[PDB]
Amino acid sequence: SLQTSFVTLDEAIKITNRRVNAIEHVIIPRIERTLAYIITELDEREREEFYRLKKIQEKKKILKEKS
Amino acid sequence: RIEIFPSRMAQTIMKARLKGAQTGRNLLKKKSDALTLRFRQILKK
Amino acid sequence: STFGYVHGVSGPVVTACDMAGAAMYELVRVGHSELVGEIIRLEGDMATIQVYEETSGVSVGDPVLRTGKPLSVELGPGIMGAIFDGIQRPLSDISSQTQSIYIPRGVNVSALSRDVKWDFTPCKNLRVGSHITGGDIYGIVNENSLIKHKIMLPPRNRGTVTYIAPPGNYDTSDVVLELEFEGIKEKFSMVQVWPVRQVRPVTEKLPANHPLLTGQRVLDALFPCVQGGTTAIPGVISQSLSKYSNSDVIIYVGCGERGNEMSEVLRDFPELTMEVDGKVESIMKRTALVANTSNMPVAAREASIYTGITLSEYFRDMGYHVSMMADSTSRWAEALREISGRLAEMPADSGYPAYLGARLASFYERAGRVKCLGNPEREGSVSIVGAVSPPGGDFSDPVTSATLGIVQVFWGLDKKLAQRKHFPSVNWLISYSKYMRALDEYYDKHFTEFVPLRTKAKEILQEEEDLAEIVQLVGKASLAETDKITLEVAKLIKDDFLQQNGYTPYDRFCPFYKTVGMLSNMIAFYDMARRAVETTAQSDNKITWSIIREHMGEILYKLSSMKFKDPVKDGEAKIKADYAQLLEDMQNAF
Amino acid sequence: NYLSQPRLTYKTVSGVNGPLVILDHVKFPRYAEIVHLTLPDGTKRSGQVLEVSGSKAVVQVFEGTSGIDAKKTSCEFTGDILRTPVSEDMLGRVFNGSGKPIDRGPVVLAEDFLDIMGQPINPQCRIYPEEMIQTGISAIDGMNSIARGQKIPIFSAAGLPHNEIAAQICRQAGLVENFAIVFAAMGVNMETARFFKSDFEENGSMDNVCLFLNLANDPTIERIITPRLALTTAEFLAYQCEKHVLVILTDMSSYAEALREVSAAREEVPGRRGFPGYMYTDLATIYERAGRVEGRNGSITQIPILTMPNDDITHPIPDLTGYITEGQIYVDRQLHNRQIYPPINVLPSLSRLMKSAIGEGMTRKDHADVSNQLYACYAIGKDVQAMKAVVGEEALTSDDLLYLEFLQKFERNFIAQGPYENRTVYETLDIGWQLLRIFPKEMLKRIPQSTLSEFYPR
Amino acid sequence: NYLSQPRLTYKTVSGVNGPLVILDHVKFPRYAEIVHLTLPDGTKRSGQVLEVSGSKAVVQVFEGTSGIDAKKTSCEFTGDILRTPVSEDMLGRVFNGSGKPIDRGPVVLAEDFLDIMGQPINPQCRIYPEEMIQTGISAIDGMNSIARGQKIPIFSAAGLPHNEIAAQICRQAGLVKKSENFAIVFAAMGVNMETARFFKSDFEENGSMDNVCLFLNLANDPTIERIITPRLALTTAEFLAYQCEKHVLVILTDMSSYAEALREVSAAREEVPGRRGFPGYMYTDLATIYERAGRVEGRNGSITQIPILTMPNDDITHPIPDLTGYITEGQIYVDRQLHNRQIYPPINVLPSLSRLMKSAIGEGMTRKDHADVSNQLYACYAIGKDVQAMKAVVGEEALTSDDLLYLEFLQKFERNFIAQGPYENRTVYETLDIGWQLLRIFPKEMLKRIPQSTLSEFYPR
């Protein structure tokens, strides 16, 4: 009774130990370097909006100076 | 390896996917400790 | 100096020279066709004008005559059952006058018809020589069998009555009242002209205490709304507010609506009748629509919101309870982004203007239960339900994030419940209501059973949610027995209590005694089954839910069939809840 | 009526940058006024006034500013706005993006000149579409059914067969009456041009196809007036000589790219991703010319195709078209890589006018419930398909194996039909019932027992 | 230092765009002058001067620009900056954002006039906070106690009862009985009609109004008045504290709604927005109102701040809870997990922290066991939260007898210690007695954070 419980536990604790490490090595680092890509790509849109809005303000002083 | 497009909404989605994966470790690691503790005490028996 | 001259036009904005004594937000009439415009910027002699109509073919040098008054609406009889656009031109009268299918964009049709005669009566407690101030109910005109349109004095002026009209039939242009002030005897008709950007004066603001019975079961129980409150949904559905929604008049502002979806609103509303006193009366006698499609020009989207709330505050002052449904404030918000880009203003986050949260605050905070002006001493209320971006930018979006800092109730419709066709798709985790402290005075008086049930029903719905993430990881096999009694009753809540069919003839409107009735049985079932497992544990042979779920299969059918009682009972529906309760008391005695 | 004054002709151009020509000393210039540019070579180009201020007028030319001089270029001002010559000979004729013939035909011989901006339809006298258009595609007919007079886009990408499924629903127009097809092709390739031109003449449909198009070698400012020239003829046929028009607008992203190019040249304040802030107003003024009216019996149906960039539905073009139009059709790339035809992902697709188009009188009875359940099992079966890869194959239910068998049956029998199958709607629902019978009872929660009792024992 | 010259009245407006009115031919305009706009129909509006350039003076009108003519309006230049009329008689008075009374009351007689911007404090003369402020909430007083001069925000979200615990810790605040000169300045910013009526019906009608200086600012009244509102509230809280020598607790809510008012006037000056639309000078502008706290050397009064703010989309990376994290001294968290569990106040104490709670508590200050009962209640709640998930995934029978005891601790910790009801004012001694009742259910030799010098007395009872 202890023999057949021992032999089916380690073959069911190997499949749990793989499911932990597949999260730790394959799933969690993939989400985290996805999340790093979201941050830098959103910062690159903010510089594009900063360059467009500053260029409008530079052109708005040009028309104001002549007029 | 990246998955989807950055929108200011995907960041909250990817943080929700990360949150389930962070709690997918500790909820499943402690199962792997509960199994191993009985696996070590059966071997002593 | 009376007139102006077009200096330039680029789309909706028109620069007009020779406009020296012009004030901001006045109405002008630009062009030979006299397009209605509004002054939005003035620099010295030239003024910048946004036009509510299409400026295709306007030339330089066209006359711009000013009117000396801001954008305003006409308030009087002939307004219920009507359909307007953003600047209050009647779409029903403008198609009979022109006999075409087009709006000729030069047609100054009056908002209220000056040909229909209305049977006027006086207050009766008002003689000649009586003193009268603003907001006093002066006469009563019955437009329909339902609405008594109380004629009121405008809140600006004051005087002494010298002439009052006898009870008869009058037009909207006939003089009905003469008032003597210190200087001049002033005339008065049955219509008043009030600016839409100006908040209407009133005596004193009141706390809201009575709830607005929506008819939906999740909306009336978990996240209740009051009459005089502010609500935001991420949105026609809505006929629950049309047939009941216990308020005297309803208005509906369609801002940025689609063309074949605005057409479905104004097609079924004349033929969607309700019950009042056993009579089958149509809701159009107490409904008035402000229809503004996305084809219409961009400046009319801003005016359509302020048109509605001005009509809603107008029927507030008569003592009625107004329920205003403003549809899409993401469109209204988009007009603001479009116009601010045309005036070269600087944007806030995501391109929206910096005053986005201030424009929404000046509209949502015009709603509330409030004691009206005038001597007859009546009380009115305005409820506002506004729609926002439905699936996206969940709580970080400039329209939604600015709205949630203002509104008190937020019924968050989930897309994931809608993908699984769980209707209504209001999810209970991110939704909230803030009128829960204000309604416990009403709930300790009329339905005293309710408050300990709603406190526990929200606990079971999250106890399933905190346990739903457990089953999808490790499985249901190692679950406890005080936990499996949550997963069955909460699933019984999500299918019986929360699910509701809007086209089914008994679940299209669920009264509050039916809501408290079936909720008091689904939690007494939860409390008795909790009682069985806990005190009788580990010594007595008590069922670990496996023999209960098959033995209650007739009784669990009675709980799941409890959403079927109707309008063809109230007495029978009340005693059946007590019938099913005493059925469960015998089962727990085992 | 007729304007008889002689046209003024200015040699006074004072700036040329991009598409725009800037004039001065113009005497009382109108807005949106058409200008005819005469080059120093003698070639004639058209124009449209975009902005006036005093004596200055900003005009965008339709054929580009290549070779426009400052001293020698003369432009005459036509005293009215752009009006398209419309007639019943344009059916079966090929023009370009400016209304000039391509098929070696003559100029148009109008019965009237109509404004390209149209007249605004009164919302009170506009009747609501209830007649269902069959397209022959079970992904479109069964799940996202199209009413007669509904605006409904096709959301695609670069490299997906949107043009192939557009021509399929163009030749199979259902109504269980000789749809007059107006076809505007903006920013298409020459292979996309020869695909639509040969397909319409293969079926003999070009007796009544009014196709006029705009390639990529053609200038981009013609793409601004190409939908407005398309709908001002399609509403001459729907609302004035009562045909049942079906309009297909492709590519609606290439129209918005030309709109951004003009707004960048005018130094405007841009909206999201450089597009102008008035792109919501410009797209709505060419989408809301649909539906039908109460005095006429003709109708106009719009299917505007647009390829969203980088498979992003949150891009400014497929987001703003989602607010104006009445439900979208989503062409998926993942189904296209699996060699599945009508790769139509039905899970983000929608048709908001499908409720009044189905029922008892129009289709057969069980339509409202089989499509409500085919969506429901597909939504959960796609969710358990993502869990098959992560945790386990045999994991956490035996009922998920029925959900993963529904996915193989839905994507291969229901939606994948080939480019010439014209399925009727009764074939579509009966195919969908064959995929529902692999599910047992008391999981079909969206189907009531009044309609479940007939079709499950079949 | 009286100014005696008469005021000039200009009828020379030249441009109107947005909230801004541009004036010409002004004689020596000062930068932050208050002006008075007289409309053609006689209505009066105020306004600051936004920018002055030689002869031009660009003013922004408070109440809006609608109806302002170009020919007939008349601006009235007051030569001075905005000054706050301060007194001790502003204690039990309800004021609106700008300055004006709201409870039908009189204008304050004002024994001094003080500038709203103030002047920055000397770091050399600012002494370190030592004593404790009693709030009456066990989640705050027992676990994350605040000092006399500490600044500590409450991080919340929309819909959570952060306004109901703002009115609570104003209604039952005190310094500790210790067996004395306490006031409260409440700045309500960007509130609704119902949140504004809730605040007046609370304090007033609860009896707290002998020491409350409550300042309303609704969503109708102008957005420029949201900027001058906490500058007003901290000016009166610098006159009561170390000019009248009393301990003042300042509550600022909502501090997230302050920054959209800061964002709005920034774009009115045609300034280019920084990160996420918020301006670049927001860390300086939040520093001008957060750092008006602490206690000083030769004065017995003090001032402490609780700036209550809501994070958008529950994101701490947002600049509103991030720039206040660099400058304040610990956070209190209102979570949606405990709020949906019907626990009031919904304060979780694992991510919450008070950086100056070591100084606040002590032997002379509350009593000697405070440093150890809070360290033990934090430890058993953290361990008890871990075993609470093993009941779900492993089994109710597999967990041992000691892990079952942590289960029974957490069920009584969240219902008896944290959950207290909106009217129960537990003192700091009643807080530790409830905390010792939840530690007595554990046996000895598990309470490892408490030394035996204090465990010998308080455990047997």
Q: At residue D59, what are phi and psi to the nearest 5 degrees?
A: -120, 130
Taking only residues 1 to 45 of chain B, the set having a beta carbon closer than 8 angstroms to any beta carbon of chain A reads 1-4, 6, 8, 10-11, 14-15, 17-18, 21-22, 24-25, 28-29, 31-32, 35-36, 38-39, 42-43, 45
Q: Which burial class, exposed, middle or buried, applies to C221 when counting CB atoms under 10 A from its CB (0-12, 13-18, 19+)? A: buried
Residue whose structure tokens are 């002047």:
E119
What are the strands, taking DSSP E only, across C173-218? 177-180, 185-188, 192-195, 204-205, 211-212
With beta carbons less than 8 A apart as the criterion, state whether E344 and E418 touch.
no
Q: Do C344 and A60 touch (CB under 8 A)?
A: yes
Task: Note whether C292 and C324 are same-domain residues.
Answer: yes
Residue C444 burial by Cβ neighbours in a 10 Å radius (0-12, 13-18, 19+): exposed
Q: Quick one: tokens of E301?
A: 């009064």
C positions 288-307 inside 8 Å of D (CB): 291, 293-298
A54–chain E Cβ distance below 8 A for any pair = yes
CA E191/CA E178 separation, integer angstroms: 36
Neighboring chain A residues of B39 at a CB cutoff of 8 Å = 6, 9-10, 13
CA dist list (Å): E175 to E248, E329, E428: 10, 20, 10
Phi, psi of D430 (to 5 degrees): -70, -30
Rounded Cα distance, E228 and B14, in Å = 39
Radius of gyration of chain C (CA): 28
Beta bridge partners of C177: C164, C188
Chain B interface disruption, residue of D312, D333, D334, D387, most B CBs within 10 A: D312
| Sign of CA pseudo-dihedral C209, C214, C219, C222 | positive
Neighboring chain A residues of C344 at a CB cutoff of 8 Å: 56, 60
Phi, psi of D148 (to 5 degrees): -85, 95
* Residue D80 half-sphere exposure toward CB, CA atoms < 13 A: 13
| Alpha-carbon gap, residue E458 to E442, rounded angstroms | 13
Helix (H) or strand (E) run with residue D196 in it: helix D190-202
Question: How far, CA to CA in Å, does E85 sit from each of C196, C348, C417, E63, E252?
Answer: 36, 34, 56, 21, 20
Residue D177 contacts residue D244 (beta carbons within 8 Å): yes
Based on the number of CB atoms within 10 Å of its own CB, is C180 exposed (0-12), middle (13-18) or buried (19 or more)?
A: middle
Tokens of D54: 């005093």
Rounded-to-integer distance, Cα D436 and Cα D142, Å? 14
Count of the separate structural domains present in chain D:
1
Residues of A with CB under 8 A from a CB of C: 53, 56-57, 60
How far does the CA of residue C470 sit from the closest CA of chain E (Å)?
Answer: 7
8 A C-beta contact, residue C221 and residue C97:
no
Cβ <8 Å between E270 and A57 = yes
**How far apart are the C-alpha atoms of E93 and E101, rounded to whole Å?**
7
In this structure, are strands D180-188 and D209-215 parallel, antiparallel, or unpaired? parallel
Nearest CA in chain B to C395: B9
Which residues lie below 8 Å from residue E335, measured CB to CB, with a gap of 6+? E160, E346, E347, E348
Q: What letter represents residue E333's amino acid?
A: Y
Domain of E84? 1-461
For residues C304 and C290, the answer to whether their CB atoms sit within 8 Å is yes
- Please give, rounded to a whole number of angstroms, the shortest distance from the CA of D278 to a CA of chain C: 6
Amino acid in position E266: S
Structure tokens given for D185: 């092709």
Paired with D113 in beta bridges are D85
Is the distance from CB of D271 to CB of D315 less than 8 angstroms? no
Helix (H) or strand (E) holding A13: helix A3-22
Which technique was the structure solved with, according to the deposited record?
Answer: cryo-EM
Q: Are residues C413 and C441 in the same domain?
A: no
C196/C509 Cα distance (integer angstroms): 34
Q: Same structural domain for residues C103 and C28?
A: no
Q: Say yes or no for a CB contact (<8 Å) between B31 and E398.
A: no
- Placement of tokens 């598409």 in the chain: D19
Please tell me whether residues C108 and C171 are part of one structural domain: no
E–D touching, 3+ CB–CB pairs within 8 Å: no
> Distance (Å, rounded) from C-alpha C55 to C-alpha C13?
9
Chain A CA closest to residue D266: A56
Most D CBs within 10 A among A14, A19, A26, hence the mutation to make, goes to A19
Do C370 and C468 share a structural domain?
no
Q: Which two tokens stand for residue C270?
A: 């004349």
Interface partners of E (3+ CB pairs, < 8 Å)? Answer: A, B, C
Q: Under a CB-based contact definition with an 8 Å cutoff, are residues C217 and C224 in contact?
A: no
- Which residues on chain B are in Cβ contact (under 8 Å) with E311? none
Inform me whether the C-beta atom of residue B16 falls under 8 Å from chain C C-beta atoms. no
CB atoms within 10 A of CB E461: 8
| Beta carbons of B21 and A31 less than 8 Å apart | yes
Cis geometry, peptide bond prior to residue C327 (ω within 30 degrees of 0): no
| CA distance linking residue B12 with residue E318, whole number of Å | 12
Other CB atoms within 10 Å distance of the CB of residue E9: 12
D83 labelled as ligand-binding? no
Q: Determine whether the interchain pair A60/C347 forms a contact, defined as Cβ–Cβ distance below 8 Å.
A: no
Considering only CA atoms, which of D149, D140, D153 is closest in space to residue D318? D153
Residue tagged 């809701």 (tokens): C283
Chain-centre distance for alpha carbon C29: 32
- C278's CB contacts (< 8 A; 6+ apart) are none
- Asked if the Cβ–Cβ distance from A56 to C344 is below 8 Å, we say yes
Q: Is B27 on the interface with C (CB under 8 A)?
A: yes
| Rounded Cα distance, D334 and D312, in Å | 14
Cα–Cα distance measured from residue E104 to residue E106, given in angstroms and rounded to the nearest whole number: 7
C292 and C418 part of one domain: yes
- The residue segments making up the domain with residue C254 are 72-115+189-433
* Neighbors of chain B by Cβ distance (3+ pairs < 8 Å): A, C, D, E
CB E51 within 8 A of CB E96: no
Compute the nearest-CA separation of B4 from chain E (Å): 20
Q: Do residues C78 and C132 both lie within one domain?
A: no
Cα angle for residues D103, D104, D106 (degrees, 5° grid): 110
Distance (Å, whole) CA E257 – CA D158:
44
**CB–CB contact E393 B27 (8 Å):** yes
**Residue D122: CB partners within 8 Å, gap ≥ 6?**
C91, C94, C95, C100, C101, C102, C103
Q: φ and ψ at D393, to 5 degrees?
A: -80, -50
Shared domain for C202 and C212, answered yes or no, is: yes
**What is the rounded (10 degree) CA torsion for C523, C528, C529, C535?**
140
Q: C226 and C287 share a domain?
A: yes
Q: How far is CA D427 from CA D141, D324, D361, D423, D450, in A?
A: 10, 32, 18, 6, 21
Is the peptide bond preceding residue E254 cis, with omega within 30 degrees of 0?
yes
Is E155 in contact with E333 (CB distance < 8 Å)? yes
Q: How many CB atoms lie within 10 A of CB C305?
A: 28
Contacts of E18 in chain C (CB under 8 A): 41, 345, 355
Helix (H, G, I), strand (E, B) or coil at D6: coil
Question: Looking at the structure, do residues C345 and C414 belong to the same domain, yes or no?
Answer: yes
User: Residue type at E293?
Assistant: A
Cα–Cα distances in angstroms (integers) from residue C341 to residues A54, A56, D132, D138, E19, in the given order: 14, 11, 41, 44, 17
Contact (CB<8Å) E272/A53: yes
**Cis (ω within 30 of 0) for the bond into E345?**
yes
Mutation target for D interface from B5, B7, B25: give the one with most D CBs within 10 A.
B5
Residue C29 contacts residue C105 (beta carbons within 8 Å): no
* C378 shares its domain with C512: no
Cα torsion angle, C515, C517, C522, C526, sign: positive
Q: Does B20 touch chain D (CB under 8 A)?
A: no
CA distance D409 to D411: 6
C-beta contacts of A7-16 below 8 A and 24+ residues apart: A9/B35, A9/B38, A9/B39, A9/B42, A10/B39, A12/B35, A13/B32, A13/B35, A13/B36, A13/B39, A16/B28, A16/B31, A16/B32, A16/B35
CA distance D125 to C100: 9
C-alpha span between D264 and D273 (Å, rounded): 12
DSSP C268-337: HSTT-EEESSS-EEEGGGGEEEEEEETTS-THHHHHHHHHHHHHHHHHHTTT-EEEEEEE-HHHHHHHHH
Round to the nearest angstrom and report the end-to-end CA distance of chain C: 93
Chain D residues with CB under 8 Å of C340 CB are: 269, 277
Chain C neighbours, 3+ Cβ pairs < 8 A: A, B, D, E
Q: Please, is C273 exposed, middle or buried when counting C-beta atoms within 10 Å of its C-beta (0-12, 13-18, 19+)?
A: middle
**Rounded to the nearest 5°, which phi and psi values hold at D51?**
-165, 135
Chain A contacts to B (CB-CB under 8 A): 2, 5-6, 9-10, 12-13, 16-17, 19-20, 23-24, 27-28, 30-35, 37-39, 41-42
Q: Which of residues 539-578 of C touch D (CB under 8 A)?
A: none
Domain end (from C172, C188, C204): C188
Q: Please identify which residue in the block is written with the tokens 């303000």.
A: A57
Number of residues written out for chain A = 67
DSSP code string of C496-520: III---SSSTTTSS--HHHHHHHHH
> Are the beta carbons of C9 and D269 separated by less than 8 Å?
no
Domain count, chain C: 4
* Helix (H) / strand (E) containing D252: helix D252-265
Count interface pairs B-D at CB distance under 8 A. Answer: 7
> What's the length of chain B?
45
DSSP D149-179: T-B--EEE-TTS-HHHHHHHHHH--------
HEC-encoded secondary structure of chain E: CCCCCCCEEECCEEEEECCEEEECCCCCCCCCEEEEEECCCCCEEEEEEEEEECCEEEEEECCCCCCCCCCCCEEEEEEEECEEEECCCCCCCCECCCCCECCCCCCCCCCEEEECCCCCCCCCCEECCCCEEECCCHHHHCCCCEECCCECCEEECCCCCCCCCCCHHHHCCECCCCCCCEEEEEEECCECHHHHHHHHHHHHHHCCCCCECCECCECCCCCCCCCHHHHHHHHHHHHCCCCCCCEEEEEEECCCHHHHHHHHHHHHCCCCCCHHHCCCCHHHHHHHHHCCCEEECCCCCEEEEEEEEECHHHCCCCHHHHHCCCCCCEEEEECHHHHHCCCCCCEEEEEEEECCHHHHCCCCCCCCCHHHHHHHHHHHHHHHHHHHHHHHHCCCCCCCHHHHHHHHHHHHHHHHHHCCCCCCCCCHHHHHHHHHHCCCCCCCCCCCCCCHHHHHHHCCC
Residue A9 has φ and ψ, to the nearest 5°, of -85, -45
- Cα–Cα distance between C144 and D68 in angstroms, integer? 68
Q: Which of C126, C135, C134 is nearest to C378 (CA)?
A: C135
Judge: D267–A59 Cβ closer than 8 Å, yes or no: yes
- Which residues in chain E are closer than 8 Å to C523, comparing Cβ atoms? none
User: Which residues have a C–N gap over 2.5 Å right after them in chain C?
Assistant: 235
Task: Give CA–CA dist C100/D293, Å, rounded.
Answer: 11
Residues in chain D with CB shorter than 8 Å from the CB of C263 are 123, 126-128, 291
Q: Are E357 and E375 in contact (CB under 8 A)?
A: no
Considering only CA atoms, which of C139, C133, C141, C131 is closest in space to residue C165?
A: C139
Q: Do residues C232 and C330 both lie within one domain? A: yes
Chain pair B-C, CB pairs under 8 angstroms: 17
Interface of E with C in 152-191 (CB under 8 A): 157-160, 164, 190
Answer left, alpha or beta for residue D149, where phi above 0 means left and psi between -120 and 50 means alpha: left
Measuring CA to CA, which residue among D49, D34, D45, D96 is closest to residue D67?
D45
